[PDB]
Design a protein around this ligand. Structure first.
Ligand code: STI
Ligand code: STI
Ligand code: KWV
Ligand code: KWV
Lengths: 257, 264
């Protein structure tokens, strides 16, 4: 189909970010001299390729082409010039990447998730390490990959192996906490083998330093024990666009002073 | 239909805002931009007079009209939604180490900037108070007018001159001769300043409404509240000059806050 391209069109450079993403390489799509990202390799691979042709949205990593006729196989996406969000936040300049920016990043991510909610997709591994940063603080959600990230995992997935858009809502709340702490690890110091029983007894992380009340209110809503008591991503996204607009106006008033 | 008219199906109506706190105002969604909005509904000339007034007011610190639905009943007036609600309850509930002196200065500055605009456009507010302001993310403050004398029960509004007045916000010339002007808004702003410095205490605490007029005419004024800076208290007092023409203009008040805010 339209997405198939010759492996010759791509100059495969070297493996991306010290291989921390696995078999994903920096590449050059030669006809356009365009730096791209290339996943190489089995039927899960083709399933991923099949899914990525079905999703398009400003804040989801954009598929550019595939190579699926003979090995080795390629999934080709855009290259995001600032890398993954967790490392960005951990190394950023906090006076440039300030509260208006942090809010902008959460708004974009909730936008991607509302889109996946709308098309009935589930993410299953939402976290800062799975998001990418471009120019102008553009953020796009991606998915790089008995092995959980327990600290991002909703109670019904720990206990019953049930995943849903609502367990992505749970993980979105933890991602908010990652943003608010510029990429600290959640539940600081807490034995991850006791997290399930702590959650069952209504333990949650306290508001991190500097986090706005309403953002923390949304985190706590994301962390409701019942999946059905959690907000939809449409509700979360609406709350963030409304906040982001208020914050942008306040930012301009402040500059004008 | 003019340029503000919007199709009803552009809005998802969700539920009464504050559950009826504000009367026939609903929380809604402007779907195409994923924005929460406030929607005022007619359960008529006065309704459309309000919409017409708001079509002339565009300022960062005033509530912004987004559209109206006037093709068939029920009629809608649509504005933005402010995440943190009204300023009075916000001040009463906030975390004071987060909402500190510089944020209070910032909120007063934004409110004075909105009133300077109303002054320049020759509008009068007539009911300026913390309960009529809204707070948004990143300490945004916007001035609104909810028509609260109709909705609010309690001692805030009391009968006077065949009307309802917030006595403790009302300038003397308005209490006495029912005369309202931008200078009686300047009086109310001084009281609003005192609401801010006290994180939302009721003005003239412990003094009965029956006493307020006589006290003000005999030159009583509220004391500087604990922690309020002296130059901010000086502005309050200038706002509470007995003769309306001795009160400062909102242009002057905003300039004074501008200067203060950048020295901090
Ligand atoms: C090279 C590649 C191959 C495949 C993918 N795929 C995805 O990112 C993805 C996102 C969402 C889904 C949707 N899916 C639906 C169902 N559930 C279960 C899972 C998610 C699937 C794949 C991305 C990439 N891009 C990628 N990968 C790793 C690193 C980088 C990268 C690193 C640094 C700078 N720029 C880019 N870029
Ligand atoms: C939905 C609506 C419809 C109309 C209005 N109108 C005004 O706010 C207003 C402000 C200034 C004037 C100027 N006017 C000029 C002269 N006269 C004398 C008085 C003032 C007129 C109307 C607001 C709203 N918004 C509104 N109403 C109630 C509650 C809320 C609300 C509550 C919580 C969070 N966010 C929003 N929001
Ligand atoms: C160290 C520090 O002060 N962090 C604070 N986090 N803020 C924040 C703003 C918007 C969002 Cl969405 C989130 Cl999650 C957090 C503001 C500043
Ligand atoms: C309880 C308490 O300490 N209140 C004080 N109010 N201050 C204040 C600063 C600027 C302005 Cl414009 C205003 Cl109105 C008040 C600072 C702190």
């Amino acid at each position: 189909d339209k997405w198939e391209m010759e492996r010759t069109d791509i100059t495969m450079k070297h493996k991306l970010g010290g291989g921390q993403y696995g078999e994903v390489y920096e590449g050059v799509w030669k006809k356009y001299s365009l730096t791209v990202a290339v996943k190489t390799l089995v039927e899960e691979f083709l399933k991923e390729a099949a899914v990525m042709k079905e999703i398009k949205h400003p804040n989801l990593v954009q598929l550019l082409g595939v190579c699926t006729r003979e090995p080795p196989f390629y999934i080709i996406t855009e290259f995001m010039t600032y890398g993954n969000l967790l490392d960005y936040l951990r190394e950023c300049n906090r006076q440039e990447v300030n509260a208006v920016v942090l809010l902008y990043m959460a708004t974009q991510i909730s936008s991607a998730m509302e889109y996946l909610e709308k098309k009935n997709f589930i993410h299953r591994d939402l976290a800062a390490r799975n998001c990418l940063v471009g120019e102008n603080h553009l953020v796009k959600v991606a998915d790089f990959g008995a092995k959980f990230p327990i600290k991002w995992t909703a109670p019904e997935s720990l206990a019953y192996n049930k995943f849903s858009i609502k367990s992505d809502v749970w993980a979105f709340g933890v991602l908010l906490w990652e943003i608010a702490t510029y990429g600290m690890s959640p539940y600081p110091g807490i034995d991850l083998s006791q997290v399930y029983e702590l959650l069952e007894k209504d333990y949650r992380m306290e508001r991190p330093e500097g986090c706005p009340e309403k953002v923390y209110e949304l985190m706590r809503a994301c962390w409701q024990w019942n999946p059905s008591d959690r907000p939809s991503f449409a509700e979360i996204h609406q709350a963030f666009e409304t906040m982001f607009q208020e914050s942008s106006i306040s930012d301009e008033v402040e500059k004008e002073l």
